[PDB]
């Protein structure tokens, strides 16, 4: 209905609770492997944030996998920063990580992160 | 780090995608039964929105259940309105449903919904 009222903080409160579940390893259903590193997560959050994960977990075979191995060229710290951003809306973008963050965001298909990385690089030229 | 940047719309975009997955029945992992009615959902979203579901799915036995039956006194339309609110931040509160919505929100332990229901009732007195 068009007669709805809206709770402004609801979406951010939901994301805060999803991040608390992730931190406590509650109902995490996939391990993302990035070279030597493993990251536990919720497939629905990954799909909701990334075009690559959306494609992976809507596949009729890959939806059932409990482990996903990323391309060996993917930087684990870049992935970690992006996983934190997925669960918090906060991106720890720094001079020392921007190239890895941008390359990882391009691979994961996260257009808004790619956009801000491009803008921060262009400003330093 | 305290040097993070934040994407304002991220949390709402995540919730919109979780609702699209729910609508298409993608990776839904629980059926909530409310009398004759069945509602498919994601346990993590339910826990993130409701004190009752948070308690249920953190229980070492109940976390594994694929079906949860609610108390027979719970109104299915009241539950439907609250499930939509969980996935959208929008509450379809109307004169004809407010009593059922408030009672359901008290049972599910959704304090902000209970608060607005109380305020709307008090205004009509």
């Amino acid at each position: 209905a068009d007669s709805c009222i809206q709770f402004t903080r609801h979406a951010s409160d939901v994301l805060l609770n999803l991040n608390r579940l992730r931190s406590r390893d509650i109902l995490t259903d996939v391990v993302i492997v990035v070279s030597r590193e493993q990251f536990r997560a919720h497939k629905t959050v990954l799909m909701a944030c990334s075009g690559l994960f959306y494609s992976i977990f809507t596949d009729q075979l890959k939806c059932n996998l409990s482990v996903i191995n990323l391309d060996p060229e993917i930087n684990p710290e870049g992935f970690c920063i992006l996983l934190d951003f997925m669960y918090t809306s906060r991106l720890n973008l720094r001079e020392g990580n921007i190239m890895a963050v941008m390359a990882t965001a391009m691979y994961l298909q996260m257009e808004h992160v790619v956009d801000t990385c491009r803008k921060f690089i262009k400003a330093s030229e | 780090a305290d040097s993070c940047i934040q994407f304002t719309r991220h949390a709402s975009d995540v919730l919109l995608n979780l609702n699209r997955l729910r609508s298409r029945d993608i990776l839904t992992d629980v059926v909530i039964v409310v009398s004759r009615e069945q509602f498919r959902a994601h346990k993590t979203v339910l826990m993130a929105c409701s004190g009752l579901f948070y308690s249920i799915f953190t229980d070492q036995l109940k976390c594994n259940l694929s079906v949860i039956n609610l108390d027979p006194e719970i109104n299915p339309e009241g539950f439907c309105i609250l499930l939509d609110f969980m996935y959208t931040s929008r509450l379809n509160l109307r004169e004809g449903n407010i009593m059922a919505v408030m009672a359901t929100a008290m049972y599910l332990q959704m304090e902000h919904v209970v608060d607005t229901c109380r305020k709307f009732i008090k205004a009509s007195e």
């Binding site: 709805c4 009222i5 809206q6 709770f7 402004t8 903080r9 | 929008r90 902000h112 607005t116």
Partner: peptide
């Protein structure tokens, strides 16, 4: 919080 969206 609550608002008219």
């Amino acid at each position: 919080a609550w608002v008219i969206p």
